[PDB]
Amino acid sequence: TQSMRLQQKINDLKPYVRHARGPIKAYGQAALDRASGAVSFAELDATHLDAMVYIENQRNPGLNLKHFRDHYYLIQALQSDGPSAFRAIFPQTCPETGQTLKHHVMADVRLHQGAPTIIITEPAVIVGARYQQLQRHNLTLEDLSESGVPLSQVAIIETQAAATSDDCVMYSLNYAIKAHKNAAQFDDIHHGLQHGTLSTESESRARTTLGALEASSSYSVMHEGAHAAFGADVLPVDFYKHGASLTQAYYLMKRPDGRMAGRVNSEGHSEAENLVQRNQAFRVKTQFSASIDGFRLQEIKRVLAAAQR
Ligand SMILES: O=P(O)(O)O[C@H]1[C@@H](OP(=O)(O)O)[C@@H](OP(=O)(O)O)[C@@H](OP(=O)(O)O)[C@@H](OP(=O)(O)O)[C@H]1OP(=O)(O)O
């Protein structure tokens, strides 16, 4: 697929798709076609998300991942007897219509004895080219607040890893898994949020699209109390592995704190791989990393593997 790493993921998935039947087979073929260089995946990913969530919860007990069809049901889950730690994927909602509009995000949640803390990871941008994502995030914050969640215990972390919103379900799913794998670091962020604080926010918020808008307008444009920061400042390099942009990867590795500049593949591998090397390994053709499309192939394979053994 012009990319040997991607082609290997294509070849690994193909026989499962051949033996599969029904909607999941079609989903697999579409994903294969996409990785090969061949309609709207936000809707397709979302349709099959429950199956992948169900599988991943089994592969990694404690992941506690849920797909909610609206953030309304996230709020309901905060008012129930479930686990103290869980993750949620949900689409954004248009305030004027109640219509859900994809543009998914991942929320990592902690319940506390006896005022939850909530980290929302935004794989694209908080504000949006037509300020639509900002309005959708404000709706979530507004509803959280009205339900009794202090927004000072809520953070929206903007990573800008996604170049478009077409793959946001896959970024959100990947992000849920990474949040679980890095639960200790998330635990620490939640502890801060219990005290109404987010580390690095005093500098990091200004680096986000939200921060730019706040500085430009001198207006409060996000509901007061909620925190925001740029992904690289507060999250591990894990969250940038599927970043589309080669140049982003380059600049992230240039950061003085070196936090984005280490190994990104597991140690079991003979040769180490950093963020730029990974991006180039998944480069396809105007050039971008199709790594996230590889992640989708991996997830479908995991689902079909359960169905076929
Ligand atoms: O063992 P897991 O924690 O479930 O890791 C898997 C995978 O390994 P397996 O297919 O053997 O299970 C790769 O991880 P590596 O050991 O090769 O580093 C893979 O990486 P590639 O994308 O390069 O193929 C991918 O990881 P990722 O999302 O980090 O890119 C993924 O980890 P996830 O399940 O969290 O996606």
CATH no. for residue 135? 3.40.395
Separation of CA 154 and ligand 1 centre (Å): 29
Apex 26 CA angle, 244 and 282, nearest 5: 20
Beta bridge partners of 67: 89
By residue range, what is the domain housing residue 67?
61-236
Distance CA 285, CA 272 (A): 25
Number of H helices, E strands in the chain: 13, 8
Tell me if 243 is assigned to some domain: no
Number of domains in the chain: 1
Resolution of the entry in angstroms: 2.0
Q: Give yes or no for residue 61 CB within 6 A of ligand 1.
A: no
Q: Are 126 and 208 in contact (CB under 8 A)?
A: yes
Separation of CA 204 and ligand 1 centre (Å): 29
Tell me if 15 is assigned to some domain: no
Q: Give yes or no for residue 268 CB within 6 A of ligand 1.
A: yes
* Phi–psi pair at 121, nearest 5 degrees: -95, 120
Tell me if 221 is assigned to some domain: yes
Tell me if 203 is assigned to some domain: yes
Ligand 1, closest atom to CA 265?
Answer: 18
Tell me if 134 is assigned to some domain: yes
Ligand 1 pocket test: pick from 6, 278, 289, 298 the residue with the most ligand atoms within 8 Å of its Cβ: 298
Q: Give yes or no for residue 260 CB within 6 A of ligand 1.
A: no
Tokens of 106: 């991942």
Tell me if 5 is assigned to some domain: no
- Look at residue 304 and give its three-state secondary structure: helix
Distance CA 278, CA 264 (A): 8
The residue type at 177: I
Tell me if 4 is assigned to some domain: no
Tell me if 248 is assigned to some domain: no
Q: Give yes or no for residue 80 CB within 6 A of ligand 1.
A: no
